[PDB]
RNA sequence: GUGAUGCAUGGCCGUUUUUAGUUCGUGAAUGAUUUGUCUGGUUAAUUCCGAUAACGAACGAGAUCUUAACCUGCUAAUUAGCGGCGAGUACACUGUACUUGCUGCUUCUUAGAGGAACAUUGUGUGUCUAACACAAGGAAGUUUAAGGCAACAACAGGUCUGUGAUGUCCUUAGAUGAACUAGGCUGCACGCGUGCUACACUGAUAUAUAUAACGAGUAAAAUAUGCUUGCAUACUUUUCCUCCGCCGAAAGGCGUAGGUAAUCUUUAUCAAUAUAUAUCGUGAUGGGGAUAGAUUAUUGCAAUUAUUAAUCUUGAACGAGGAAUGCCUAGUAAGCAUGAUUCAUCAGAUUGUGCUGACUACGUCCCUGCCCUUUGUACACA
C-alpha cells in the first residue's frame, strides 16, 4: 500500500513514501526531471536504471527532503530510494525479488541501502578548522 | 555629571564593579574571569 | 602581445588560434554558421 | 502543564511521579513530552590575563523543559501536582479549557 | 514577564549571591547549607530579593587566625577527615608562611583521584584564603568521599 | 547495460599492463555514471586501488585553492574533454584515458641513487601530472581549461614529448639513470 | 537541449512540473507580447540591489523579475516583499573587507508587485499575511506552464 | 587608588604535557641513593606480556563524563510532523499540483531509557605470550570520531590593570581618590607579527536557478492638561528580534503585527560557494578596489583625526611572490558563507555552526623538538 523510510547523506534526510501507483517518482512537489543541475541528475535515476523502469510502474513515489546543501541533498535522495523500493519489495511483493534487487544494489556500490555516517566535527579553537590551527612566527 | 547610560562605563560587573570584560548574554553582567569562578554554582557545567 | 581583430571542426579557440581574432567574435561565427562551452561540427 | 529544570534525572522521575498519580483514575494524561533543550552556552576564555595560549572553555547550562496535558478540574490537578518537590524543578500549570 | 532562559541564570547568578553572602557572614560556623539571631539574614535576604570540604577549610582558616604550628593543625585536620570516614585526603597551604619567599606544603593521607567525572563527582573540594600578618595563607582543600560506586572496581563475589 | 556518462560504456576497454589492471579498478562494482562518488577511499591503504579513474582525475582537476572543493566544474571540465576526444582525434575517451595512464609513471626514480616505482603511486603521478600540465596551459593563455585537458590527454595517449607531463617524466626517468 | 529518456511519466499539470528559466523566459516573451505590464520611469538606470554594483545588462530584466516573482509566489503560501528581497539577494564584495550577504532593492520588487496586482494576478489577503497569488492569476500561469511542456514536447 | 612591587603572596591560567609519567609499603643492595619503575616484544599509553632482588599497592594512563555515529520499526506527541477527511482551484485517466476548516500513525521532528563491537567469526604474522595485519559480517573495526577531565613536581612564566583575594611602601583636598571639559591611545623615514583582498577565463560581470547548521532575541520615550523653548501634573504604548503594508535608487524611514519563544522574527529554509543561460576575451583588462573627491542616512549629548552605512565618481600596488617559515591524514586541507561574543553604532577578530569535499601518507628518525638506557662532566643560578 504504502512505506516510509530515509535516506541520509551528512545533515540532509530525504524521507521517501513510496505507494501503491502508476510510477511518477517526486520531490516535495516537483518531478525528478528537475532535481537541479544536469550534471548530478544520474545519482537519484541510477537505483531505478538498476532495478528496472517497468518494475516501478506499480509503485509511485513522493520524497520529502530537508537540510543539508545539494550534492548532499541528491545523496539523500538516491538513499531514501534504495531504502525504500527494497523495503517495499521485503513487505507487499516477494522475497526473492527483493534479494534480487539487494544484490543487483550491491554490485552497483554501497549508500544506496547502508548510509554514509560522516558529519562535520568540530572546530577547535586556537585555529579556523576542525584541525587547522593559526600561525607562529617565532 | 554626564550621560553614563550606554557604553562601557553606563553599567559593570555585577560582583567587582570593573567595567571590563563583562559577559553581557543573557544579562548576567559578570565579568568573564568571575564568571569562571562561580560558572559551577550559576549551573554552568563544562562537557564540551 | 597578440592585439586581435574584429573587422575582417569547429570550436572558440580553435577559430581564435586560425583567423586569430576575440573569442566574442569567434561565438559571433559560430552562431552565423549555426543559423557556456562550445562544440560544433 | 510545564516543567522546567536543569536537572535531567530529577526531572524525569518528577514526570514519572505524575504520571503515576494520574493513572491512579480520572485523567486522560498525553504522555511527557520533552522540549528542545535550549542550551545556554558561554565560550569564555579561561586565564584571567593575555598569557598562554588563549584556551577558552566552553561552559553549558543545558535547561529541560517537559510538558504535559490533561482534561481535569483545578483542585484536582493541585492534588496531583503535591507529591511534595523541591526547589530545583519548575512547575507550572496551565488550567485553560483551549 | 521573563524568559525562561533569562530566568535561569537569574537564579543562578540569586544563588551565587546568596552563597557569598553567607561565606561572609558565617566565619564562626561549619558552613554548607543552602536551603530556603537568624531572624536579621531572613530580613537581609527579603531586602535583596523582594565529611564536608567547605566546612573544614573553614575550621583551618580559624586555626591559622588564632595562630598554631600550621603543620600541626594540618595533622589534626587530617586524623579528623580520617576519623570521619574519609577514603582520602589532600590539603594544601600555599603563600608567605614563616620565610618570605614561596613555600607550598602538601598534607594528603589516603588516596585522592584527580582525573575523570569521578574527581568532580566523589571529591568534595574547597577554596579560602586566610589574611595574616604579613599578606595572605591560600587553603586548599580536597576531600574523597565514600563513594555509588567507583568506575575503576571489578568486584567479583 | 552499465554504462558511463550514458555514452562511453568501458565494456569495449583494453589495458595490456596487467599492473596497471591490479593498481586502477575498472570494473563491475567500480562501475559509474557520473565521477561523483562519495567514497570512503583514504580510510583505508589500498582502498584508493577500489576508486574508479574517472574519479581520480576529477578530484586531480579539482586542485589549486581559488578553485578548490567545487567538484561539479572539474566533473563538467572532464565531460567536456571526453566528448572532445570522442569528437576531434576519434576514438573512446575511456581507452585514450587508459593509455595516457600507461605512458604516465614514471618507472624509476631518485632517492638520497635510484628506485623503482610501486604501480598505484605511478598512476597517481601520472593523473596528477596530467591534471598540472592542462592547468599550466590555461594559466593566463585564453585556450580554456577543457579544451587544453583534452590536447594533454591525446599527447599522452600518442606518446609524444609536446606535452608537459610527458615531458616531466621523461626527465625523471633520465634521472633515474644517471643514479644508475 | 533538456528532454532525454526518463524512467517514469511526468504529470505535466502545474508549474513545479516544469523547468524554472525557460517557463521564466517564456512568460517574458507572453508579457512583451501583450504589453500587460510597464517599465515605470526609473527601472532604465537602477540598480536591482545593493551588491551588484552594476546595471542589469539584459533589456527586459523587469519583466523577467516579474515572472520569477510570479513562480515564488506560487510556490510559497503568503509572501512579503522583505522575503522577495532576501530571495533576489547576492553577494557584496566590499571591496578588500570580505564578502557580505546583500539584499535587494525592494522598491522595484515592491512596484512590480502593485502592478500584478492592479492587472488582478496577485492578492494581497486580509487573513494570514503579506500578498499571494489571486486564483485566476494561478490558473492563467499553470496554462502558460502547460503551454510550454506542450512546446517541449514537440 | 586601572598607584609602586607578580622577586612579598592568594586564587586562577598557562607551559614543561596531553607526554606518560610520579609515588609508597615491606624486602634487598656507611651514605646521598638504587631497585621495584627492566635486556627484549607489544601498546595511543611505567598499556600489557616475558625476563627478574623483588613482590604488592596507590595517583597518572585506561575506565568514567559529554556529544556525534546505527537500532529498538518498544517509551512519548506539543509549540513537530505524518496521514485521516471535508471544502475547493487547475489539469490528467476511466490520480497529480495548490490553499482554507476540522481532528488512527511516530518512519522523518524532538529526547529520555535501553541496545549495539568484544578485534566477534574467518586467515596470516608474533616467544604461535601480550598483541598486531588482512578478509567477511556489519551502522561502525586506527580505545568508532571528537572533545572534556587532568597526577607528581616545578618555572623566581603571567595576572595586585578582574576582584572589597592582599602585605608593605607611596599618595590623602594645589589627592596618584572620585567627577567634568576637551585631546590622545588610531600620531609615522622604518623593522617584525595575525589576518583580509588580489593578481583573472576552473574567472569577473549580470540575470535565473538550487539548496544549510548552530543560534540569538523586551532609569528612556509618546500624548494631553496647567503656567512661564522650560518646568509641573496626568496617562500609556514603545527600550531587543523584526514579520507585514506603505514611502525611499540606495541606505533607511514611517505605520502597525507576532514573539518573554519547537508557537512569532524564521527555519519544508536566514547564507555563499554551487549550477544554468547571457556579456566579456587575455589586453594592468569590464581582473583588482587601494587612495581620493564630493552627498544621503543611521547610531549617539557629541561623528572632524572622516563610527558605520549607502549613491556617484577616483582605477594605485599586484602577471603566483626572494631569504625563510606555518598548518594539515577523511567530512578533515582549502574554498564558501553564516550564527554568536564584544554591541548605543561598527568584523577584516575570536568563537561556534554548517555548505561545496582535494592531494598524499598509512611510514621513518634525516632535520626539529621531547622522552629513555648507556657514557662523560670541573655544570647544580645546571
Ligand atoms: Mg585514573
Ligand atoms: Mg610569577
Ligand atoms: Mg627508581
Ligand atoms: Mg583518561
Ligand atoms: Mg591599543
Ligand atoms: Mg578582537
Ligand atoms: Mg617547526
Ligand atoms: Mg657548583
Ligand atoms: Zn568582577
Redesign the pocket.
Known sequence: K?????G??????????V?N??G?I??????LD???????KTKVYEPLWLIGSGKLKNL?I?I????????????AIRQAIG?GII?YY??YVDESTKKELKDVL?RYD?SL?????????????????????????? | ???????????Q?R??????????????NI????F??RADIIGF???? | ????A?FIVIT??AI?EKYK????????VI?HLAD??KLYT | I?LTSKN??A??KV?SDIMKGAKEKNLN???????????????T??????????????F?L?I??????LYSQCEVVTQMTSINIDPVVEVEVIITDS | ???????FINDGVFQAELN?FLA?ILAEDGYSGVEVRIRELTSLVQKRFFLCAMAQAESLRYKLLKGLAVRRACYGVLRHIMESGAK?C?V??????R??????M?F?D????????????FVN?A??????????????VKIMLPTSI????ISVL | DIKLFKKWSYEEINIADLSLVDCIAVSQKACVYTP?????????????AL?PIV??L????????????????????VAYAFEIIHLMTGENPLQVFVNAVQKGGPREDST?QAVDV?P??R???A??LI?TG??NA???????????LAEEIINCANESSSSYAIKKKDEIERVAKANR | ?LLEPVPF?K???????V???????SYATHLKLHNKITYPK?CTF?????????????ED?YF??A???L??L??????????????????????????????????????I??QL?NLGYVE??P???????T??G??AI??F??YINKKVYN
Open positions: 504504502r512505506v516510509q523510510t530515509f541520509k547523506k551528512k545533515t540532509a534526510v530525504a524521507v521517501a513514501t505507494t501507483g502508476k511518477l517526486k520531490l516535495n512537489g516537483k518531478n528537475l532535481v537541479e543541475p544536469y550534471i548530478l509511485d513522493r520529502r527532503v530537508k537540510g543539508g546543501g545539494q550534492t548532499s541533498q541528491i545523496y531504502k523495503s521485503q513487505k550491491l554501497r541501502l547502508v548510509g554514509d555516517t560522516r558529519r562535520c566535527e568540530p572546530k577547535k579553537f586556537g585555529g579556523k578548522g576542525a584541525r587547522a590551527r593559526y600561525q607562529k612566527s617565532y | 555629571v554626564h550621560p553614563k547610560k550606554y557604553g562601557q562605563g553606563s553599567r560587573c560582583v567587582c564593579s570593573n567595567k571590563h570584560a563583562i559577559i553581557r548574554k543573557y544579562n548576567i565579568c568573564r574571569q568571575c569562571r569562578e557545567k563544562k562537557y564540551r | 602581445k597578440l592585439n586581435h574584429v572558440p579557440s581564435a581574432v576575440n573569442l566574442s567574435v569567434a561565438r559571433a552562431n557556456s562551452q | 510545564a535531567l534525572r526531572i524525569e514526570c494524561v498525553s504522555g511527557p513530552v520533552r522540549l528542545p533543550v535550549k542550551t545556554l552556552r558561554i565560550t576564555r579561561k586565564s584571567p590575563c593575555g598569557e598562554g595560549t588563549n584556551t577558552w572553555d566552553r553549558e543545558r529541560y523543559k517537559r510538558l504535559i496535558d | 514577564p521573563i524568559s525562561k532562559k533569562r530566568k557569598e561572609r582520602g589532600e594544601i597551604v600555599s603563600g608567605k608562611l620565610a618570605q619567599r614561596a613555600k607550598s602538601k594528603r589516603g588516596y585522592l583521584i584527580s582525573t575523570g567525572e569521578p574527581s568532580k563527582r573540594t577554596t579560602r584564603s586566610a589574611q595574616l600578618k604579613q599578606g595572605v595563607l591560600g587553603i586548599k567507583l568506575p575503576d572496581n | 561523483h562518488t562519495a567514497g570512503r577511499y583514504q580510510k583505508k591503504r589500498f582502498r584508493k576508486c574519479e581520480r576529477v578530484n586531480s582537476m579539482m586542485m589549486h585553492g581559488r578553485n578548490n572543493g567545487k567538484k561539479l566544474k572539474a566533473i563538467r571540465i638520497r610501486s598505484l603511486r598512476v597517481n603521478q593523473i596528477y591534471c592542462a592547468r590555461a594559466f593566463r593563455n585564453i585556450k580554456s581549461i577543457s579544451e587544453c | 537541449r511519466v504529470t505535466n499539470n502545474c508549474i513545479k512540473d523547468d524554472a528559466d525557460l517557463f521564466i523566459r526609473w537602477v540598480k536591482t540591489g545593493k551588491g551588484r554594483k552594476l546595471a542589469p545588462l539584459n530584466w523577467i523579475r515572472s520569477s516573482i513562480r515564488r506560487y510556490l510559497h503560501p503568503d509572501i512579503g516583499v522583505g522575503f522577495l528581497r532576501r530571495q533576489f539577494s547576492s553577494k557584496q564584495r566590499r571591496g578588500v573587507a570580505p564578502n557580505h550577504t546583500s539584499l535587494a532593492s525592494g522598491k522595484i520588487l515592491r512596484s508587485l502593485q496586482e494581497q489577503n487573513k494570514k499575511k503579506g500578498r499571494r497569488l486564483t485566476k494561478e490558473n499553470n496554462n506552464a502547460r
